[PDB]
């Protein structure tokens, strides 16, 4: 069963802006997504200090980077707190509404896209390089869900039936045909050693057969 939703008007506008604006420094998407995953890991770690049973769904706190040249996908896997169905449908869009509006005022005030994470909406920078984004997430207090959107004002949420994750978030970037450089090993190594050397968790780059 798949439910389709509409993006709240403001982030429907931000996403079209990101997709349609000619902007060459597209590599900052990896910094933001890794930065988001690091925030997700910080959250589950802080909760475990007052409740070690929260790590029963997995103790390893790390981030994995998985390119796939055949499928033309770059997957980012963290073992952070994960996300609930209310997070994917309402809660985050409500916290982001002010950041989206503020980010768009700043874009006219001279600021460029690279500062998107400063407004707490850096996840949508994925659409700089991805035509479709699929998110598999698992929170301690919810089932496993699958989130997907190809921009255009709508997204879908369904109960995932594939391989269980235990706990964490998996962001699958179905890359644009001209953005395949982000599937190359030395390119990903450069972005991580230029944008995210000071992340407090291991960042493993899965290299291909
Ligand atoms: Br899936 C998914 C959906 N929305 C978001 N955000 C909204 C504002 C900031 N992040 N993150 C992940």
Residues 6+ apart with CB under 8 A from 146: 134, 135, 136, 157, 158, 159, 160, 162
DSSP 207: -
Domain residues for the domain of 18 are 2-205
What is the chain's alpha carbon radius of gyration, rounded to the nearest angstrom? 17
Ligand 1, atom 9, residue with closest C-alpha = 121
Cα-to-centroid distance, 92 and ligand 1 (Å): 6
Domain count, the chain: 1
Of residues 38, 46, 48, the one with CA closest to residue 76: 38
36 is in an annotated binding site: yes
Q: Give the domain CATH number at 25.
A: 3.30.565.10
**Secondary structure element (H or E) that encloses residue 34, with its range:** helix 28-48
Give the resolution in Å: 2.7
């Amino acid at each position: 069963e798949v439910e389709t939703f509409a993006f709240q008007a403001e982030i429907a506008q931000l996403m079209s802006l990101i997709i349609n604006t000619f902007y060459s420094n597209k590599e900052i998407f990896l910094r933001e997504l890794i930065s988001n995953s690091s925030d997700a890991l910080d959250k589950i770690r802080y909760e475990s200090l007052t409740d070690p049973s929260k790590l029963d769904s997995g103790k390893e706190l790390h981030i994995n980077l998985i390119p796939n040249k055949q499928d033309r996908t770059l997957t980012i896997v963290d073992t952070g707190i994960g996300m609930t169905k209310a997070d994917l449908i309402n809660n985050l869009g409500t916290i982001a509404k002010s950041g989206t509006k503020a980010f768009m005022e700043a874009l006219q005030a001279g600021a460029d896209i690279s500062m998107i994470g400063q407004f707490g909406v850096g996840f949508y920078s994925a659409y700089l390089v991805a035509e479709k984004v699929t998110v598999i997430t698992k929170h301690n207090d919810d089932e496993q869900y699958a989130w997907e959107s190809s921009a255009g004002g709508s997204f879908t949420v369904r109960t995932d039936t594939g391989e269980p994750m235990g706990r964490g978030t998996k962001v699958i970037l179905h890359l644009k045909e001209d953005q395949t450089e982000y599937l190359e090993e030395r390119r990903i190594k450069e972005i991580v050693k230029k944008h995210s050397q000071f992340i407090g968790y291991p960042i493993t780059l899965f290299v291909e057969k």
